Amino acid sequence: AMKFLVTGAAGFIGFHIAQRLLNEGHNVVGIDNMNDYYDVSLKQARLDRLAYPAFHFQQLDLADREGMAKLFATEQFDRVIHLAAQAGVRLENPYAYADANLMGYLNILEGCRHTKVKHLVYASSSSVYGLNRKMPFSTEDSVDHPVSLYAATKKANELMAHTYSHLYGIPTTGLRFFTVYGPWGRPDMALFKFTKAMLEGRDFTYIDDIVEAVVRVLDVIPQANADWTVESGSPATSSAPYRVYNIGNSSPVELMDYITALEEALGMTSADTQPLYDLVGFKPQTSVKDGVKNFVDWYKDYYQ
Amino acid sequence: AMKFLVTGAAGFIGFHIAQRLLNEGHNVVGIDNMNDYYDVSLKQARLDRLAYPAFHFQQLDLADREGMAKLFATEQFDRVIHLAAQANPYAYADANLMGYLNILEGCRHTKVKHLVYASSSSVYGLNRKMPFSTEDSVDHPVSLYAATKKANELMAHTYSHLYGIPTTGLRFFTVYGPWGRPDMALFKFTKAMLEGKSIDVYNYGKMKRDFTYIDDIVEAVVRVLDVIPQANADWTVESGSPATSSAPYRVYNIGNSSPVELMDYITALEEALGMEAQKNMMPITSADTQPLYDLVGFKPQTSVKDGVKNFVDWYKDYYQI
Ligand SMILES: NC(=O)c1ccc[n+]([C@@H]2O[C@H](COP(=O)([O-])OP(=O)(O)OC[C@H]3O[C@@H](n4cnc5c(N)ncnc54)[C@H](O)[C@@H]3O)[C@@H](O)[C@H]2O)c1
Ligand SMILES: NC(=O)c1ccc[n+]([C@@H]2O[C@H](COP(=O)([O-])OP(=O)(O)OC[C@H]3O[C@@H](n4cnc5c(N)ncnc54)[C@H](O)[C@@H]3O)[C@@H](O)[C@H]2O)c1
Ligand SMILES: [Cl-]
Numbered sequence: 001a002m003k004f005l006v007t008g009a010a011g012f013i014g015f016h017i018a019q020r021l022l023n024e025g026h027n028v029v030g031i032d033n034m035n036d037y038y039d040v041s042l043k044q045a046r047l048d049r050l051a052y053p054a055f056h057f058q059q060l061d062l063a064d065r066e067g068m069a070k071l072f073a074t075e076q077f078d079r080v081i082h083l084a085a086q087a088g089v090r091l092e093n094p095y096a097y098a099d100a101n102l103m104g105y106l107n108i109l110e111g112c113r114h115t116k117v118k119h120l121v122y123a124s125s126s127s128v129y130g131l132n133r134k135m136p137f138s139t140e141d142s143v144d145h146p147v148s149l150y151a152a153t154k155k156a157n158e159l160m161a162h163t164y165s166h167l168y169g170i171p172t173t174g175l176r177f178f179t180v181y182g183p184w185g186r187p188d189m190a191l192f193k194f195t196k197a198m199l200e201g202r203d204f205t206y207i208d209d210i211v212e213a214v215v216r217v218l219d220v221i222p223q224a225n226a227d228w229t230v231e232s233g234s235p236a237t238s239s240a241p242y243r244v245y246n247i248g249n250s251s252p253v254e255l256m257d258y259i260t261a262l263e264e265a266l267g268m269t270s271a272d273t274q275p276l277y278d279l280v281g282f283k284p285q286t287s288v289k290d291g292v293k294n295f296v297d298w299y300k301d302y303y304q
Numbered sequence: 305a306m307k308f309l310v311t312g313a314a315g316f317i318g319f320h321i322a323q324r325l326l327n328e329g330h331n332v333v334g335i336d337n338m339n340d341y342y343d344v345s346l347k348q349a350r351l352d353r354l355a356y357p358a359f360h361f362q363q364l365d366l367a368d369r370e371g372m373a374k375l376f377a378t379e380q381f382d383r384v385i386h387l388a389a390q391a392n393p394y395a396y397a398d399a400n401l402m403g404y405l406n407i408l409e410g411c412r413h414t415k416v417k418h419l420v421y422a423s424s425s426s427v428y429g430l431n432r433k434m435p436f437s438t439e440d441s442v443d444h445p446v447s448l449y450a451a452t453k454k455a456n457e458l459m460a461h462t463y464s465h466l467y468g469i470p471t472t473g474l475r476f477f478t479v480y481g482p483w484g485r486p487d488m489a490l491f492k493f494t495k496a497m498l499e500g501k502s503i504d505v506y507n508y509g510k511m512k513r514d515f516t517y518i519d520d521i522v523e524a525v526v527r528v529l530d531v532i533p534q535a536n537a538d539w540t541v542e543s544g545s546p547a548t549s550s551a552p553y554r555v556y557n558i559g560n561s562s563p564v565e566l567m568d569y570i571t572a573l574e575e576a577l578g579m580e581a582q583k584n585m586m587p588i589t590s591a592d593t594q595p596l597y598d599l600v601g602f603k604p605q606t607s608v609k610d611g612v613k614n615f616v617d618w619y620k621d622y623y624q625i
Contacts, residue, residue, distance in 0.1 A: 091466065094405060095369070102405075103397050103401065103402065106393065106394075106401075106448075110393060130461075130541075131541050131549065131550065132542075133541060142546060144442075144458070144546035145461055145465075145546075146458055146461060147465050147466065148462060148466070149463075152461070156451070156454075156458060159445055159451040160448070162429075162444055162451070163447060163448055166430075166446050167447070230429075230430050230432065230441060230443075231431075231432060235443040239430065
């Protein structure tokens with residue numbers, strides 16, 4: 001079987017990707033540092049649901065140079081899906097972003113270089129669009145004006161990916177994420193905060209739709225293009241085997257619809273995502289009603 | 305008096321910037337980790353020539369978070385000229401990514417009034433349209449060094465935007481002159497010549513390298529340090545460039561438009577050293593500096609003829625040739 005590394009495997013998206021890859025018969029190695037940015041017991045709960053014979057978990061920090069080098073050298077991964085990062089756009093704790101998103105990403109790249117990983121798929125962010133105002137945001141647009149350190153680190157990942165694709169031939173695909181929600185979600189994002197505070201005192205994609213797109217992209221390996229030039233190409237293409245795509249749900253939905261969906265279930269800025277829907281022949285088809293219902297059902301089940 | 309931090313102060317460019325600032329009457333703190341990428345005795349020799357009462361040196365690594373914080377906290381700098389960098393992939397990350405964040409944090413928390421920092425022409429990457437302009441996209445780097453320099457520009461943009469720290473990045477091409485670095489420019493050729501090593505020569509020696517004499521770089525940088533970028537509510541991405549912003553953020557090319565080709569430098573060195581260089585012929589570019597001309601009202605004045613003579617005068621004396 002193929003051997004995949006899923007980083008951030010105890011996290012929201014990593015858990016779902018690892019779970020899907022395991023259900024498809026692959027060998028999966030998961031790593032996560034189980035940091036306390038949010039409830040570590042939630043991460044542990046996710047990690048407990050990945051107990052499969054073909055799943056191996058290693059608590060490892062991305063910034064651990066020797067540890068990371070050893071992991072790559074020993075496992076000889078076929079592909080890597082890199083999701084571990086310090087997320088959240090919203091100034092306090094800059095060193096966490098440098099550690100995880102800059103140094104940590106270079107260690108991923110070094111691992112891929114030394115062991116000739118066949119495809120590295122990694123998480124970028126819509127925040128790279130920064131001060132841009134021309135809508136819908138497109139990967140053909142310049143992304144030079146980030147307004148958060150988090151965004152700057154994600155663009156730096158794309159630049160580093162380009163460098164490694166060009167020098168070493170490692171195929172890379174960066175995915176610019178918008179807002180993801182669903183069961184086993186993040187405590188620090190809106191949908192969860194609301195549900196919790198509500199019980200006490202935008203571009204949204206349901207997690208299953210994200211998983212489906214990422215697993216298809218993992219199988220589409222970028223190839224070199226000797227005819228590509230900067231002057232007639234894009235910041236998301238290259239002569240190197242390098243690609244960047246927006247991932248999301250191009251649907252007109254303001255924040256109030258989801259707020260209304262919560263109250264219904266509890267009883268009390270645009271983006272061009274067409275290049276990805278084409279490449280993999282899939283488009284998100286989960287309705288806000290079903291999505292929030294799945295979240296609340298999970299929320300109530302898990303927390304009560 | 306004003307107090308400046310010069311990082312990389314025992315290095316080539318940093319030494320010259322610190323020396324000039326001291327000669328203008330300013331207070332300067334120089335830092336360097338004295339690494340052995342090239343001869344540490346040369347770095348110490350530069351540091352010896354910065355012995356002035358208004359100069360203080362601290363051996364400090366850019367990646368030492370607590371050490372960097374202590375430096376900024378105790379000194380309360382008015383301005384910073386950041387030149388220290390690796391130019392081992394982990395060295396680039398340490399010095400050029402984490403180290404740059406320590407600089408930005410220091411500037412943020414102590415309200416430094418202007419941060420000038422070294423970028424590089426390598427950010428132009430796969431670009432082919434000449435001349436290279438700061439209006440051009442710089443999304444396709446071909447080296448980790450280049451990617452880290454573009455990352456510095458991105459990080460500078462975010463700090464200028466969020467905290468109002470004025471930042472000016474300078475995309476250097478090639479610099480040469482007295483107290484230069486042994487691995488580059490005229491020093492590289494001179495060393496090769498005196499050791500009987502062959503110099504690789506591309507495109508019949510007609511490659512137009514962008515070489516600027518150190519004194520011309522120093523004059524420009526010291527003028528730039530005094531031009532503080534301002535916020536601009538009229539700027540938009542759609543009508544702007546990767547080197548401008550609504551934030552007090554600017555990036556400029558710094559270099560020499562002279563049409564002198566590589567062979568002009570080699571021939572001049574041969575004459576100055578009184579010998580002929582061994583050459584290996586390899587079987588079978590320009591930059592726009594108008595924005596810095598409109599900004600500081602100064603262009604490079606040193607000819608190749610004089611620059612080469614200046615270099616050789618330094619080299620012979622320092623190495624007791
Ligand atoms: N969920 C979203 O809406 C969203 C939006 C934009 C971008 N992203 C990106 O997608 C990826 C996954 O996000 P998520 O929502 O699952 O976040 P998450 O925080 O739930 O998952 C990330 C996991 O990475 C791990 N991690 C962080 N730093 C680490 C380090 N230094 N070493 C090892 N492990 C480390 C964390 O412990 C966590 O479990 C991230 O790169 C994030 O930037 C997500
Ligand atoms: N010389 C050129 O032609 C040229 C061209 C393009 C860019 N630059 C840039 O200009 C800057 C100055 O370069 P230079 O040519 O004077 O090089 P240099 O190597 O002579 O000087 C740099 C100094 O930085 C110090 N340093 C490196 N890493 C450090 C760390 N982690 N902590 C503390 N000190 C550290 C070194 O010890 C060195 O003395 C660099 O940022 C470089 O990328 C120079
Ligand atoms: Cl030189």
